[PDB]
Design a protein around this nucleic acid. Structure first.
Ligand SMILES: [Mg+2]
Ligand SMILES: [Mg+2]
Lengths: 71, 136, 171, 175, 37
RNA sequence: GAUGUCGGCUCGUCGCAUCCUGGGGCUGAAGAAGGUCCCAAGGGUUGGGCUGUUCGCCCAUUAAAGCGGCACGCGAGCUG
RNA sequence: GGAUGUGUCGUCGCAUAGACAGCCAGGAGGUUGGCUUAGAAGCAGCCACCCUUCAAAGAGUGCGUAAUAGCUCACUGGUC
């Protein structure tokens, strides 16, 4: 999971402090190719049950969230 | 710790706490239950203990201060004059007085941090919180 | 709390005065207790009532009831402890009424049991202690356990058949 | 809130679950003998910002607010209460608890939220129309961010008794 | 046996059971054995 | 109008906060050798070199070569 | 300084819609969270404590290994 974000955004290690100087930003369509290769291991239902779990790994790593719900 | 300048020497006497609230500054506090002479190094022990426990923040309020000179026994004597200023500095602490108060740390993060500090003190103590509104 | 007592067939509780006597098919086993607390058969089963509810009365309550159940289950079917020897060369035999162990010590250990208690050995690396009173069987087996306590490095010694032992292990 | 007698001889209440108190406005300055347990249970809910209907011996219901409490040192238990007899249309200056809402984009960064004034003095609100709390947003704050008097929302027709540039909530750095 | 004049709770396994008017501690781990004399 | 003062010798006895020996618990206790704490005062606790020395250092052994009290125990007992 | 010693009064909760304890049984997918390193995976230290499935499982408490695994708890039903 760590390598898929590191290759797409262009990260080497991660982040020493995930609260101060951030890392980068990614788009929502990129989440489709991560969950499709990691679908047999997933216990989740369909569509909404896999799109929300992947985004959480970008939190502690330092990669900023794009868009989200409402408006 | 020690004061900057003054008079040099003093005296000694006791009766119940004068100017020591409960709240103000912090959320939780530590209160003396017995009358004592709190040494400079005694406070410096408590500061360091609580300081370590919180790691980063320094949200500790030291309400007491060693504004008092104490003297000592050069080696034996009595035949001769008044004694050495430079033994220690003290804060006269009467029951009720708040010595220390903490900010931002949790209930337990304070119960324990004060428990450790108590063990470095020459007197019985107790932990306190809110509802102290005389003047603000 | 402690309240219900199951009393099958050959039970005969003659709890007169301070001697709370219990006669049955597996010999006569007597057991003494406090008179300050009440005890008698209420038709089919038994009950041990307590007067006060402070603490000194509460403590003797649960104790008095378990001990009567122990004396009841005693004269009913009986008590039997299963012990297991472990370690190279360790073995036990029978010399009449006495148990004889050969467990690593320069001389062989012999244990003559007290009254009502009986020793038995199926395979020479297994000991069986059976008798009337739970305490006497408890002690006798503990004395046999004392002969060699299982060690923290190899568990060699006298253990409780299906007994679990933690192993330190140095070298 | 209920109470009995009122003399200057307090041995009849000393050992008992009672606190000697008073209520004043500019007419009746009535002395008390209220229940310690009841006053404690209730005062902790209402504080100074709140008031309660106090019925004396028999039936004389009066609305009153808590002015000052003089508690015993050594044992933090209160010993004397001062009540202020509420009018109808206009009250006094009331110290209001300054609380916080939401996380700060500075608190998570390295520092922490420090409420300098725990209670705030406010001019002419109106009695029975007094703010029981004082919610203040902190989210906008970083490190070196102060919030003064002229930055706090006052609930309908209320004014600040304290100075315009008096620091209320400041977010402080680490160590 | 670590004879400490101030026996306190270390982990959720220690059972404080008194003996002949003295504070004694019985626990699963052998190092945890605390007494006052 | 006097309670002889250091050390030694002689003679003992007593406390235990135990040096040995006895019993235990934990151990970073495999065994052997230890460490450490608890219980324990019955007996034991070497001979020399240097120094008035107590002390201490060394030699050679030991199960061990304990620390203290007794007017820094003991001069109507000796030394000096 | 310490402690389920008994006596009496208070504060906070959880409960016959069945709790505390106890036995059967589950143990989280992501993920060997990122950093930090010769390795640091729930468990040497810096930042957070987000998500999915539901009857439930906390980037998780203490032990174990050199890092793993093991074996449990915080939480979830039955029997009571
Ligand atoms: Mg002289
Ligand atoms: Mg020994």
């Amino acid at each position: 999971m760590s390598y898929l974000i590191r290759k797409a955004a262009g990260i080497g290690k991660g982040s020493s402090t995930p609260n101060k100087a951030k890392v980068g930003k990614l788009n929502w369509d990129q989440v489709l190719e991560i969950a499709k290769t990691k679908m047999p291991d997933l216990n989740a239902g369909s569509v909404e049950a896999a799109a929300n779990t992947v985004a959480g790994t970008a939190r502690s790593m330092g990669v900023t969230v794009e868009g989200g719900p409402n408006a | 710790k020690r004061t900057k300048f003054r008079k040099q020497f003093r005296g000694r006497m006791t009766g119940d706490a004068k100017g020591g609230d409960y709240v103000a500054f912090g959320d939780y506090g530590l209160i003396a239950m017995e009358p004592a002479w709190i040494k400079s190094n005694q406070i410096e022990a408590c500061r360091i203990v609580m300081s370590r426990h919180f790691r980063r923040g320094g949200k500790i309020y030291i309400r007491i201060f060693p504004d008092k000179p104490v003297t000592k026994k050069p080696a034996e004597t009595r035949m001769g004059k008044g004694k050495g200023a430079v033994e220690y500095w003290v804060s006269v602490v009467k029951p009720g007085r708040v010595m220390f108060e903490v900010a931002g740390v949790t209930e337990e993060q304070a119960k324990e941090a004060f428990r450790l500090a108590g063990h470095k003190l020459p007197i019985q103590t107790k932990m306190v919180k809110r509802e102290v509104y005389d003047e603000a | 709390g402690k309240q219900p007592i199951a009393v099958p067939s050959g039970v005969t509780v003659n709890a007169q005065d301070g001697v709370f006597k219990v006669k049955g098919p597996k010999g006569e086993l007597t057991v003494p207790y406090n008179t300050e607390l009440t005890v008698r058969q209420d038709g089919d089963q038994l009950l041990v009532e307590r007067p006060s509810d402070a603490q000194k009365h509460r403590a003797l309550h649960g104790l008095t009831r378990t001990l009567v159940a122990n004396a009841v289950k005693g004269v009913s079917d009986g008590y039997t402890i299963n012990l297991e020897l472990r370690g190279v060369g360790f073995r036990a035999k029978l010399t009449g009424k006495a148990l004889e162990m050969n467990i690593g010590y320069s001389h062989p250990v012999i244990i003559e049991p007290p009254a009502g208690v009986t020793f038995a050995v199926p395979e020479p690396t297994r000991i069986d202690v059976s008798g009337i009173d739970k305490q006497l069987v408890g002690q006798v087996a503990a004395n046999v356990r004392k002969v060699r306590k299982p060690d923290a490095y190899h568990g060699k010694g006298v253990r409780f058949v299906g007994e679990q032992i933690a192993l330190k292990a140095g070298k | 809130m209920e109470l009995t007698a009122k003399p200057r001889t307090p041995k009849q209440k000393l050992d008992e679950s009672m606190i000697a108190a008073v209520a004043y406005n500019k007419e009746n300055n009535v002395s008390f003998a209220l229940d310690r347990k009841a006053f404690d249970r209730a005062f902790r809910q209402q504080s100074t910002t709140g008031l309660f209907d106090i019925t004396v011996e028999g039936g004389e219901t009066f609305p009153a607010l808590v002015k000052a409490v003089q508690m015993d040192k050594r044992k933090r238990a209160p010993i004397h209460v001062d009540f202020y007899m509420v009018t109808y249309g206009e009250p006094v200056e009331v110290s209001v608890p300054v609380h916080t809402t939401g996380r700060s984009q500075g608190e998570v960064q390295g520092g922490l939220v420090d409420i300098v004034v725990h209670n705030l003095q406010i001019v002419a609100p109106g009695p029975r129309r007094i703010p029981q709390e004082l919610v203040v947003d902190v989210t906008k704050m970083n490190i070196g961010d102060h919030i003064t008097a002229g930055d706090i929302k006052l609930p309908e027709g209320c004014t600040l008794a304290a100075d315009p540039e008096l620091t209320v909530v400041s977010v402080l750095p680490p160590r | 046996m670590k004879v400490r004049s101030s026996v306190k709770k270390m982990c959720d396994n220690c059972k404080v059971v008194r003996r002949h008017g003295r504070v004694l501690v019985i626990c699963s781990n052998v190092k945890h054995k605390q007494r006052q004399g």
